[PDB]
Nucleic acid binder design. Structure first.
Lengths: 155, 59, 138, 101, 113, 117
RNA sequence: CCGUGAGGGAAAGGUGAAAAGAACCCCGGGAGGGGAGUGAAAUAGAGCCUGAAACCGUGGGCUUACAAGCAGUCACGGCCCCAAGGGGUUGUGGCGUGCCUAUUGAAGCAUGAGCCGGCGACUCACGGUCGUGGGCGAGCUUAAGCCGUUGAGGCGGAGG
RNA sequence: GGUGGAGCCUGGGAGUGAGGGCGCGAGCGAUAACGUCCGCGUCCGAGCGCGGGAACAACCGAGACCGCCAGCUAAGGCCCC
RNA sequence: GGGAUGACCCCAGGCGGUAGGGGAGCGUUCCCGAUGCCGAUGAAGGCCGACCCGCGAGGGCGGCUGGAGGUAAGGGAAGUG
């Protein structure tokens, strides 16, 4: 604001029989040095979305994805000690070729380390399930324990 | 500044037109006889000088 | 669309004098001729007019009392520089000027207006010092 | 020959080979149109009354087209009133074939 | 072929030197030289020296043959003025521009056999 | 975020300076002497099209009159004729018959005064 | 820099990948050029990337010394430039009271404006009240916080 | 009778709250004023857009979405401009 | 009014306009779209264009410069003309 600018408040020239235009201080917003008018201040863009609408969204988001034929919840993970190598091999057998992007949720931290660095896969703990991450991805893959918690998160 | 002042900025047209008579005349010259040179008339000039008459330096 | 518009018209010379004609009622006709206005190429921006030679000017009749009464006028740019001259005296000298003034005022006032006026040739006479044709009009 | 045909609320002196443009005729792009709409001939047909009766000039529509754009601008002073219209008149081009009356 | 000169930044008003340039446009180098020599104008000197330089170039650089030379084209563009404080009555204080010139002269050859 | 003017102003301005080609002096150079000029130019054009349509009605009439004056009668009367005759045709435009093909004009006159005996 | 002083308070970024930053010759007192030379590029040559406008030049086309004007516009015609079509210019004809503001009323002899470029004015927080897109419904909803994330979301019914 | 950019009802957003001329009817004024105050009407305002009136907000004609090198009229005009 | 709703065609009205009210757009900065796509066979910006689309705000295309960045559809935010 004009108020927050360093310049002093001295009146810059008389006001009257100068022959120049009228002015107070050089911090005014017609002044180059001066303050900006309704410029941004820091503020908070958060707001509290209805929890229920969140349940709905989350439920639906998966559903669209189920309807698509993309939801595949699994059990097999011999792809252990989170090595990208191991996961990838495992993925091949599961027909996850990397031709579409994939959202993998699971509580098993080793499979999490396993993908991650793959650039077509978005890795995720189940409490982190959320529509955006769901939607941005083309294909959805869940641990059955992850599908269990997803159950609880609705009803 | 005070009393009279110009009322309107003057056109480039009206300016260049006032300057119509500003072009200079080329200096008026002729050849030094007895010397190979272009001087103004009625003047002793150091290419030559004159005859039985004073000038720069010549042998 | 037609640009009916002509290529340089071969202008006409005409000799005209109803010596005992009301000026004005003459002058009106003169003018019409001066703009190519009788002719059906009339072209407003061009001067495809006639050349009109008035012979035996002076003589011009005029209605009511318009000598000492019609007053021709000249303001020389000066103080006191209005001059008023009766028509009597215009006839009495420069009679060829009487008809001219009356015609002028009836022609358009631009540059062409001026150019056509010079296609009007007026002689207190008769005898017209240019033999260059002259279908006499009556 | 000669012929003064009328189309679009406008008349035109046509001839065995030319035409210009003349406003939307609902005519198939390359078709034939009779402009039975007709006055005059080059050996003095005239018209007894408006249209010479079973006289028609055939023209061949070459094609359709919007004219060159005009910019129609309106302005009012001391009242902020400024307005742009782009306008292009569409037409059809004909070629006069024959004047058969 | 042509030969060019240009004296950048001469420090004399353009308005003022054009005066002498316009005195020699389209002239043999022989003409020009006499013309400048007896022209009564500070600018003649700067223009003389630029015209002389172009001749050297013509001859020495593009082998162009002196007697054939003339002033094809020549002109002066203003350079960036020096702005300068000039004090007036009542405290007033003006800025004065010391104008500076970019004089150019370009020679070519004449007629033939 | 900040959205400075950037490029935008320079362009509204030289859109308009294009339209100003060939105007005298500053009217073709000043971002805004051009502008002014062009409002007025714009109105001139609009009304002047209206006028063009009246300016030619006028021209035609005057050489129609001329020509039919060549055969005794005049334009007041001549139009009466055409009117009655039913030949609302001529369309002052197309009494350029006056010039190209007077033959044809001559007739037209005849038919005209025939409606009037 | 200004002011005795308290105090006031600017401006000013950018070669190029690499300085390879132009030996040597030429005109000049130098400053500057012209050749040579480096470079992918020198109208990248040193306050050197990009280089708009005002403004000033040079050349070329059309044009003007008996016409009167808000400077344009409509029409014809001429001459100039690539082609049954354009582009430029303007001779004559018709028409024509600048822009903004303020006013009952402005071409106005009422205000503002030398021109060009950039900067420059209806917003955000919390409450309210209409409307609208949705969620659930005799119910709806959570705050602070707590846990989880490390651009993940949960929990939390004090309260309203 | 009358379907009209009529009406009535509920709500959101206004701007205006400085008028001007003309005609008619009164007051004031001097049966003065481009005067002043109301009343009915109208236009300018916002229609300094178009035609007439030499020129000219509000007198006459007439309510301008765009185009035409078509036609018929309005007021007012038809000796020349 | 059709109604193979086609937002595509007929039928009828209307479309001067200041304060104002409403409705549809254009363009600027930034965000998701993006670990993507365009870019040295030349980005952004600049100089022309009598060419194309748009009622317009504008959008393309073509040549010249420029020399390294730019950013769809469809959404979102504002130091937005």
């Amino acid at each position: 604001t004009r108020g927050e600018v360093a310049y002093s408040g001295r009146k810059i020239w008389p006001q009257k029989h100068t022959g120049r235009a009228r002015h107070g201080d050089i911090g005014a917003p017609i002044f180059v040095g001066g303050g900006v008018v309704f410029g941004p201040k820091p503020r908070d863009y958060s707001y509290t979305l209805p929890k229920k609408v969140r349940k709905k969204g989350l439920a639906m988001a998966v559903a669209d994805r189920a309807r698509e034929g993309k939801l595949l919840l699994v059990e097999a993970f011999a792809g252990v000690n989170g090595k990208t190598k191991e996961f990838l091999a495992w993925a091949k057998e599961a027909g996850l070729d990397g031709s579409e992007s994939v959202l993998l949720v699971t509580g098993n931290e080793l499979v999490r380390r396993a993908a991650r660095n793959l650039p077509w896969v978005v890795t995720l703990a189940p409490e982190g399930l959320n529509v955006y991450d769901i939607v941005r991805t083309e294909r959805l893959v869940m641990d059955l324990d992850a599908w269990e918690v997803f159950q609880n998160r609705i009803g | 500044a005070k009393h009279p002042v110009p009322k309107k900025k003057t056109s480039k047209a009206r300016r260049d037109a006032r300057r119509s008579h500003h072009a200079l005349t080329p200096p008026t010259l002729v050849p030094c006889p007895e010397c190979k040179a272009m001087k103004p008339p009625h003047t002793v000039c150091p290419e030559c000088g004159y005859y039985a008459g004073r000038k720069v330096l010549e042998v | 669309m037609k640009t009916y518009v002509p290529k340089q018209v071969e202008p006409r010379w005409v000799l005209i004098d109803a010596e005992g004609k009301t000026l004005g009622r003459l002058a009106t006709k003169i003018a019409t001729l001066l703009r190519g206005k009788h002719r059906p190429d009339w072209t407003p921006n061009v001067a495809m007019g006639d050349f009109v030679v008035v012979v035996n000017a002076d003589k011009i009749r005029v209605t009511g009392k318009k000598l000492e009464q019609k007053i021709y006028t000249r303001y020389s740019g000066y103080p006191g520089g209005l001059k008023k001259i009766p028509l009597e005296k215009m006839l009495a000298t420069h009679p060829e000027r009487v008809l001219e003034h009356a015609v002028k005022g009836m022609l358009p006032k631009g540059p062409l207006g001026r150019r056509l006026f010079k296609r009007l040739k007026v002689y207190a006479g008769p005898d017209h010092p240019h033999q260059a044709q002259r279908p006499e009009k009556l | 020959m000669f012929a003064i045909v009328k189309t679009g609320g406008k008349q035109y002196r046509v001839e065995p080979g030319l035409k210009l443009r003349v406003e939307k005729l609902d005519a198939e792009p390359g078709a034939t149109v009779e402009l039975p709409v007709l006055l005059l001939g080059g050996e003095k047909t005239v018209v007894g009354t408006p249209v010479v009766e079973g006289a028609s000039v055939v023209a061949e529509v070459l094609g359709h087209g919007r004219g060159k754009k005009i910019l129609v601008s309106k302005f009012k002073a001391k009242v902020q009133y400024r307005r742009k219209k782009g306008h292009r008149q569409p037409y059809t081009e004909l070629l006069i074939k024959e004047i058969r009356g | 072929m042509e030969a060019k000169a240009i004296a950048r930044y001469v420090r004399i008003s353009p308005r003022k030197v054009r005066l002498v340039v316009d005195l020699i446009r389209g002239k043999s180098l022989e003409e020009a030289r006499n013309i400048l020599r007896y022209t009564n104008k500070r600018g003649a000197y700067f223009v003389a020296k630029v015209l002389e330089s172009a001749a050297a170039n013509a001859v020495n650089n593009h082998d162009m043959l002196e007697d054939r030379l003339y002033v094809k084209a020549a002109y002066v563009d203003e350079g960036p003025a020096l702005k300068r404080v000039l004090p007036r009555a009542r405290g007033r204080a003006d800025i004065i521009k010391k104008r500076t010139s970019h004089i150019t002269v370009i020679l070519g050859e004449k007629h033939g056999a | 975020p900040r959205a400075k003017t950037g490029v935008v102003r320079r362009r509204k301005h030289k859109k308009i300076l294009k339209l100003a080609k060939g105007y005298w002096g500053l009217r073709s150079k000043s971002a805004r002497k051009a502008r002014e000029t062009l409002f007025a130019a714009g109105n001139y054009a609009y009304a002047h099209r209206k006028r063009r349509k009246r300016d030619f009605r006028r021209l035609w009439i005057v050489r129609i009159n001329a020509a039919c004056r060549q055969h005794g009668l005049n334009y007041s009367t001549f139009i009466h004729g055409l009117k009655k005759a039913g030949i609302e045709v001529d369309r002052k435009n197309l009494a350029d018959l006056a010039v190209r093909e007077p033959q044809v004009f001559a007739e037209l006159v005849e038919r005209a005064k025939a409606a009037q005996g």
